Structures are given as structure tokens and as C-alpha cells.
Amino acid sequence: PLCSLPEGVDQEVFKQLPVDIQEEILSGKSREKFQGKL
Amino acid sequence: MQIFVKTLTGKTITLEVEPSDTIENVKAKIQDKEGIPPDQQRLIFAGKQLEDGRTLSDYNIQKESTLHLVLRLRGG
């Protein structure tokens, strides 16, 4: 489920990361670098 | 050996580490590179996340290893 990705997100890096990280970013959590777009 | 850390934003970061060093050393480097603390800094190798209580060689971290930096749970 890569329909909702963060800003400046890298598809290659996303599909390359494990399901654990793919679910962490999809949940909309763990955002320190930039501010979420709610 | 130098390793490349590609963040979720496709940001590659070259770090000079060794197969004998510990993950803690690799993470520290990224800090002086991007500026992310060990609380929000996460590593990804072999399809799994690494820990600070282990050695690079433990995860089979070879030269020019393609590491992936991920943001950990943060307050905001």
C-alpha cells in the first residue's frame, strides 16, 4: 500500500524498505525531519 | 570501508566505518551528516533494522553497504 507517501519520499527507497518501515511511514508517524501534511 | 545511507527521501550519506566497529558508531556519523538523534535515527540492512548493541560484521555489513536511514517514532 504505497498510495500515501510523505513529501520528498523516494519510491525506490520505499519499495526497497521492509514491510515494517512501509507501515511506519504509512501510519503517518515518526516525523522529525519535516512536518506532516495533515 | 565506506557505506552509503539512503534515507526515505532518497538522501545518500557516505560514512567511513569498519566491520569491527559497532552500529552505534555508524549512527553517530549520520548525526554529523544530517543531524538526526539516535532516538529518531533508524538503520535498515538485510531487510531488517539494526541495533546499537551489535557489530557491523554481525549484520554482514560489507563495503559500500547500501544502508537505509528511517525516522523513528517522534513526539510530533
Curated annotation (Swiss-Prot), chain A:
UniProt subcellular location: Nucleus
UniProt modification remark: Monoubiquitinated. Protein monoubiquitination prevents POLI binding to ubiquitin via the ubiquitin-binding motif 1 and ubiquitin-binding motif 2.
Tissue: Ubiquitous. Highly expressed in testis.
Residue positions of motif Ubiquitin-binding 1 (UBM1): 9-26
Domain of life: Eukaryota
Biological function: Error-prone DNA polymerase specifically involved in DNA repair. Plays an important role in translesion synthesis, where the normal high-fidelity DNA polymerases cannot proceed and DNA synthesis stalls. Favors Hoogsteen base-pairing in the active site. Inserts the correct base with high-fidelity opposite an adenosine template. Exhibits low fidelity and efficiency opposite a thymidine template, where it will preferentially insert guanosine. May play a role in hypermutation of immunoglobulin genes. Forms a Schiff base with 5'-deoxyribose phosphate at abasic sites, but may not have lyase activity.
Quaternary structure and partners: Interacts with POLH. Interacts with REV1. Interacts with ubiquitin.
Stated family: Belongs to the DNA polymerase type-Y family.
Domains: entry comment: The catalytic core consists of fingers, palm and thumb subdomains, but the fingers and thumb subdomains are much smaller than in high-fidelity polymerases; residues from five sequence motifs of the Y-family cluster around an active site cleft that can accommodate DNA and nucleotide substrates with relaxed geometric constraints, with consequently higher rates of misincorporation and low processivity. Ubiquitin-binding motif 1 and ubiquitin-binding motif 2 regulate POLI protein monoubiquitination and localization to nuclear foci after UV-induced DNA damage.
Protein name: DNA polymerase iota
Residues of the full protein shown: 519 to 555 of 740
Curated annotation (Swiss-Prot), chain B:
Disulphide-bridged cysteine pairs: none
Crosslink position(s): Glycyl lysine isopeptide (Lys-Gly) (interchain with G-Cter in ubiquitin): 6, 11, 27, 29, 33, 48, 63
Phenotype when changing residue 74 to K: No effect on ADP-ribosylation
Positions in coiled-coil regions: none
Modified residues ((Microbial infection) ADP-ribosylthreonine): 66
Cross-link (Glycyl lysine isopeptide (Gly-Lys) (interchain with K-? in acceptor proteins)): 76
Interacts with activating enzyme, annotated site positions: 54, 72
Description of post-translational modifications: Phosphorylated at Ser-65 by PINK1 during mitophagy. Phosphorylated ubiquitin specifically binds and activates parkin (PRKN), triggering mitophagy. Phosphorylation does not affect E1-mediated E2 charging of ubiquitin but affects discharging of E2 enzymes to form polyubiquitin chains. It also affects deubiquitination by deubiquitinase enzymes such as USP30. Mono-ADP-ribosylated at the C-terminus by PARP9, a component of the PPAR9-DTX3L complex. ADP-ribosylation requires processing by E1 and E2 enzymes and prevents ubiquitin conjugation to substrates such as histones.
Domain spans labelled Ubiquitin-like: 1-76
Effect of residue 72 to K: No effect on ADP-ribosylation
PTM annotation (ADP-ribosylglycine): residues: 76
Subcellular localization: Cytoplasm; Nucleus; Mitochondrion outer membrane
Topology class, membrane: Peripheral membrane protein
Positions bearing Phosphoserine: 65
Domain of life: Eukaryota
Annotated site (Essential for function): 68
Job of this protein: Exists either covalently attached to another protein, or free (unanchored). When covalently bound, it is conjugated to target proteins via an isopeptide bond either as a monomer (monoubiquitin), a polymer linked via different Lys residues of the ubiquitin (polyubiquitin chains) or a linear polymer linked via the initiator Met of the ubiquitin (linear polyubiquitin chains).
Protein known as: Ubiquitin
Taxonomic source organism: Homo sapiens (Human)
Residues of the whole record sequence present: 1 to 76 of 229
